[PDB]
Design a protein that fits this description.
The protein is mainly β. Helices cover 7% and strands 32% of the residues. The chain has helices at 145-151, 213-221; strands at 5-6, 15-19, 23-31, 34-37, 47-50, 63-72, 86-90, 115-120, 136-141, 160-163, 180-183, 186-193, 204-208. A hairpin with a 2-residue loop joins strand 11 and strand 12 (186-193). The chain binds calcium ion.
Length: 223
């Protein structure tokens, strides 16, 4: 997260870190057994780390649970990032309390102008590289479809939305991938892609979670 703030430990209780020997992506806990992330975050041998603040220090609220299964969206295209969503099942159920909690799925899509909270452990610089140990946060609005398409001609599908600031300076970034965009207490987006980070006229692009609620529910019901 570039141009954000330190969230505070365990203030974003649905935020998870996906770990394969190291943090590589975010995700969102949606029930005791299941995490939503980006399909571009797929790999084998994932351990899901819940209750994290400093990802390099055991601070006392962590739950580390290996994944038993990953399900990439049936129509994910890695070239265009259309349908950039993946579900991960935990080998055991997480213990839920106020520091580790699920986030609700949307019942309606969000509108441009809605304010949201984007979070993660990704790069905090727009030029060059610095990875934080503690969770970073950014409040940002959803942008209009027209501004999003104008920013990224030929690239924005109906399964994507832009959020952030056209002026630059405030965005998600590498290492935030897969993590949440939460608006009014609902998971509306997944950190997906963008051109660089925090660049002028190049806002963040996010998977439009409201389009996938049916798929998520039916997949959980049968897996
Ligand atoms: Ca920790």
């Amino acid at each position: 997260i570039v141009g954000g703030y330190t969230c505070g430990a365990n203030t974003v209780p649905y935020q998870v870190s996906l770990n394969s020997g190291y943090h590589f992506c975010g995700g969102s806990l949606i029930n005791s057994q299941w995490v939503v992330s980006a399909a571009h975050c797929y790999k084998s041998g994932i351990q899901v780390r819940l209750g994290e603040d400093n990802i390099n220090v055991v601070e006392g609220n962590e739950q580390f649970i290996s994944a038993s299964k990953s399900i990439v969206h049936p129509s994910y295209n890695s070239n265009t990032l259309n349908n950039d969503i993946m579900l991960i099942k935990l080998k055991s159920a997480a213990s839920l309390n106020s520091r580790v909690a699920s986030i609700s799925l949307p019942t309606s899509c969000a509108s441009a102008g809605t304010q949201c909270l984007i979070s993660g452990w990704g790069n905090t610089k727009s030029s060059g590289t610095s990875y934080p140990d503690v969770l970073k946060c950014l409040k940002a609005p959803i942008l209009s479809d027209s501004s999003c398409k104008s920013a990224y001609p030929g690239q924005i599908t109906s399964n994507m939305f832009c959020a952030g600031y056209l002026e630059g300076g405030k965005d998600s970034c590498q290492g935030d991938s897969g993590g949440p965009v939460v608006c009014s207490g609902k998971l509306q987006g997944i950190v997906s892609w963008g051109s660089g980070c925090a660049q002028k006229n190049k806002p963040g692009v996010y998977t439009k979670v409201c389009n996938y609620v049916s798929w998520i529910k039916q997949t959980i019901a049968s897996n």
